[model samples]
Target chain A: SVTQTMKGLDIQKVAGTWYSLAMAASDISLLDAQSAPLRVYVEELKPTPEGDLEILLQKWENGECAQKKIIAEKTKIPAVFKIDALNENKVLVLDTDYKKYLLFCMENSLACQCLVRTPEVDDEALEKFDKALKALPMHIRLSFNPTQLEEQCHI
Target chain B: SVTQTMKGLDIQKVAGTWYSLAMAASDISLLDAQSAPLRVYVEELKPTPEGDLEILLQKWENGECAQKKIIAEKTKIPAVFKIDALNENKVLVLDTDYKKYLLFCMENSLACQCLVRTPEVDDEALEKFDKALKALPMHIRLSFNPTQLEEQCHI
Candidate 1:
């Protein structure tokens, strides 16, 4: 069975910068895969005139900045969408409040699970983020304390 | 003479929050008309599923927070587009560097001319902003110091 996408997703509210909390390697993107986690999967999603989603992904790869694009168009199902360029027709929005905590994934032969990441949070919010990720059956294997991020190697 | 729209716009780039500088009393919107300037026009433009534009307009009207929406889809012309909900065929351009300015307008019965606005700017930038507006032939009759904007008891 597939996951339930959110209801009444105002694409406007969801369009903006997002920090990636975790990820897996199953060939979901042209991105080079590794069993170990990659740098923060930061994404800046914007709206297209076609009522679709234009995603700009940024990360650090091999001692340099790497970027890529992913496009998703609204499907007949509300809050659900399809990535036009991917072999995977399924794009699921696990959750989002527009202010914090967005969990979503892309699927094909492999299921790539990811959590919406932000730079700072309180203990309660941290608990919520962890609880949200654990609730899904996706089996995410990584975690991080956002504050102790990107600055690790600012050089 | 006709107004000039920007050329070769990437809809993605144009989709974001833009500060509305000034507006005219022409029938550019369904809102009530005023002979004098209103509060700053802040607009948040998002992309639609049909590759159109979903515009969110916010302003201080009659001492209240006023909000409205408009949707625009691309047309046969490269830089031109048509706002779906309106009777007027507004083929506008994005024209933004994200760092500088954004330009858009309407046509037919009412040729409303306006520009994206910012809340604050240094004196030098303000000079440049004035020059930019003066450079255009839209004959814009309005001006604002933003920091000094609508200071007369909004109520």
Candidate 2:
């Protein structure tokens, strides 16, 4: 029998606010991949807190952000989704039925976005994230996303 | 200013029964680290059955085994110790003495002996154990010696 390696998940990384990125016009992007950047700012990271990390995804036009909304907010381990992995470039994405949100370079770079429910794009992004992760020798990435809320809303 | 990494001292791993290879005699050499193989088994894992892990080290000699006393047992997260970095194979060991126990893997081994008056060791076995941590990659190791019963000797 083959024993599988244990890939434990770190819930802390997923517990933060994320911002979205905007795409340049004429890009003709079918998917909202480059619309709003995902930004996850951890307000209170302890196991228990009064309020959870509030996530936001805002649309930017001409360097001005608008259409701001609380894409995701968690108080006690959001039940809709969970963090899978955190990779290099400080980018973390979440898994949901409608879309997956990716927050890249959250600490330094301020950009993130949600990709449509395209299996190919999802597979590619996940694969890239996995590949980029190996370079971070000692760091184990724990990823999360607000797309889970979409499913909850639909439910 | 130098920024110190988050760290903490964990005594759980040290709470198991470790055969004293260096302290035992020639007869016990069969159970030493080289020959018969020394094993550290934690019989009573938790101190208060609901508290931290407890340990006992056994030494073998002449096809028989002898139990050693606990060096330190019934360890609770010391009031002074705080979990700085939970997942990393690293923790800051602190006490009123202002000593720091920086436990980390050297060359990938998680040996937690003493490194700094407060020495520290990084053991390979512990590192492997850390990898197996589920959901949360954090664990506690501990050990204790037994005292002689005077009534038994008098009897």
Candidate 3:
């Protein structure tokens, strides 16, 4: 399956601003619009000198945007990462072009995130994302344009 | 420059076996075929629990394949990683599809690596690689198939 499918990767190249485009999860609560675990926006991905990845995230709260930082610890395998924050599940990259789109999944939670370089979604990009999503077994799904929060939360 | 261009990256998704497809460097000696630093094979990329990256490499010596491991420390930025071994240059991902190819460069030594999932190369993949290479300022270039060594070193 693509979730466990691994490739030659260098995480540092994946540093930049990203907007959340879509989400899917087994527990549906994580995709809740009001207070969902998957509602956060990815602002930045920083690789440290120690070889771990630093993730900067943003979310709308109290009529304003709040920020949070989480570090993804590296595991013995290159394609699997451990995230202690949000949910205690192993993270895997499902698909990525390193320019336009990135699709990743969580191990135990079965939570998947689809992110894009731009807030806009064209047919081609969406089609590719949909193809990957269809292959997964998700109980709930949500799609939104993160650009709507751009005015209040500018990266 | 593409060398430092960053995106939202998940390093673990890049885990897999890869073969050296092409290389370019300002110092041509590193690309030497007989006894050069770049002549080594990339065996594996493992992410550690400490937020660092472990690199497993192989080289043909004394009529056999030898292995070496190095850890890449993460930095404040996601796209840049520090490698204490070899030339001691900051590593950057130039391009990647998380499937077919990955191109990366070093900061201090200006050493660049072009890796492929399969040992074979088609016109389309080679063209994409050539286009990226032309953009960089390089003193020397070399292309070889790592599959030739597969008979002796099977992963």
Candidate 4:
């Protein structure tokens, strides 16, 4: 789940507005659990000409706001995909550059992760997101240092 | 050093610490720049046979420790190879009883696409890699990264 969730997850570059930047878990018993200060954005990602998907979310610091009308689940596993908000959240895109950096999971533990986008990027995508977070698997590495993307999300 | 640095790496079945199942890239200048949560694995991998190859690396969110020792580079083209980090890194060994998998080339782009461990149909080593990707001019068709990996190394 942690390393293989990205099979068909291209819900339009995962919509928009992400900013958690770092965190990890998947067995370490939630690797040092903490509270609030969250803001996983995409306050609206439309695409329903007939393909279905018009979801919206901002799970914390505005606290749990998972909007809906989403449905993009098809599998056999290949770039993995599925969207049921946060629970059936079996998405798995481990890397992206639609405009900024992104490392996904929804399931398999890179641990309590969130690394967001739509924050502002370009230094050649932050220098290839700093050499792809230092060469792939570039997932969760957060033990602590999250001011909720600078004191509570709001994008 | 961007796309070729792996040719024949077998650090005794590639030492320990490894869990980066699938990935693909053929140049986009290292693509994107986002925060990670993909929780990249491999904290250390040692090798020291009068030949020399000792590396310790972590790509994202986790270790800022980065302890370094890396050294295993050399290739003019013919089946490139290197042993430290992946990016379709070049590594050729076209055949193995070596166990599990390691089909070759930072080129197929993994062979007309790792199609793995052909149990049989030697296609003459797949027609000498279909005449070696038609004598290596490869353009890029990397679309499979099913790395479902787990490890065990002892030397």
Each prediction's DockQ against the real complex: 0.01, 0.01, 0.01, 0.02
Model 4 regions lying over 4 Å from their true place: A1-41, A44-155, B1-23, B26-77, B80-100, B103-155
> Which candidate wins on TM-score?
3
Arrange candidates by TM-score, descending. Answer: 3, 1, 4, 2
User: Across residues B92-136, which tens digit of lDDT does each residue of candidate 3 receive?
Assistant: 866677787777776665667677878775446555655675676
Off by over 4 Å in 2: A1-56, A59-124, A137-142, A145-155, B1-155
Model 4 lDDT per residue over B35-147, tens place: 12222223343545543435454443343423334554534543344655545344444432234333334332332222233222333433343344434333221121222
For model 2, what is the alpha-carbon lDDT of residue B103?
25
| C-alpha lDDT (0 to 100) for residue A93 of candidate 3 | 72
Residue A88, candidate 2: alpha-carbon lDDT? 27
- Could you give me the TM-score of model 4 versus the true structure? 0.23
Compare the candidates by lDDT and give the number of the best one: 3
- Which regions of candidate 3 fall more than 4 Å away from where they truly are? A60-64, A85-87, A146-155, B1-155
Higher-ranked by lDDT: 2 or 4: 4
For candidate 1, lDDT tens digit of each residue in A1-155? 34456777777777787765444323212222221223235467786766687777665567665676778887776566687653656666766777766656565533433445466533454344444433433311223345533443111
TM-score of each: 0.39, 0.22, 0.45, 0.23
What is the total number of backbone clashes in candidate 1?
14
What is the C-alpha local distance difference test score of each model?
0.49, 0.26, 0.64, 0.38
